[PDB]
Each structure stands twice: as structure tokens, then as C-alpha cells.
Structure 1
């Protein structure tokens, strides 16, 4: 259930508004959903301000399963 299926490889940049947030903004639905923000840690979702904006993506190869290694 928590595995990649209809998606591709993605890696957050690490220098955007999202990646620069190591804490909970405390004002977005996700954060406010936390007890410390009045919530109840029931929704405990990814902070809207934390979610990366720019990540490295690449086409999937689960359907092709081609080869791209140093065959020898």
C-alpha cells in the first residue's frame, strides 16, 4: 500500500521553501491538525510549507524493464 506504483523516482532538491522547513509552520491544515496546533494528531499530514516544491524526477521503467547497467 505504501509502495510506488503509478509514480516515478523523486528526490527533493533540499534548498526550497519546503525543504528548508524542519518544523511545523503551525498554521496549515496539516500542522493545525496537530495537538500542539489545536488539532489532535489524527490527520498528522505532511506540512504544506514543508512539502518540497522542486524535486528530481525521472520517467519510470517498470513497463519497459530495459537495461541500463555496465554489462560485462
Structure 2
């Protein structure tokens, strides 16, 4: 839907730890106010372009 499942980003298992989206995650100390996938995991086909 937002995932082609076939691109580099869909195949990643590891959050980068460093992008705006990662720094938001509780697992990285963030306040969980934004709540999107790591930038490197945003499907290059299907994702909002501004998430890429």
C-alpha cells in the first residue's frame, strides 16, 4: 500500500538511528510525536514523497 516490498528501502530491517524520523522514536530517545518509519525505509515507489 505504502510498500512495494521490492525496493532497497522495503528490504531494510535496520533503522538508521540518525534521521528526523528515527530521532523521534522512543527507541532513540525521541518523544514519539512524528511517528513515521526511518527515512531509509520509506518505499521509493509508494511513499509520500516528502518522507523519502
Residues 24, 33 of structure 2: 8 Å contact kept: yes
Structure 1 length-normalised TM: 0.48
1:39 to 20, 26, 30: 30
More strand per residue: 1 or 2? 1
Equivalent pairs counted in the alignment come to 46
Q: Which has the higher helix share?
A: 2
The 3 A distance-change label for structure 1 pair 45 and 11 is closer
- With CA pairs under 8 Å and 6+ residues apart, which has the higher RCO, 1 or 2? 2
Which ranges of 4 or more aligned residues in structure 1 deviate by more than 4 Å? none
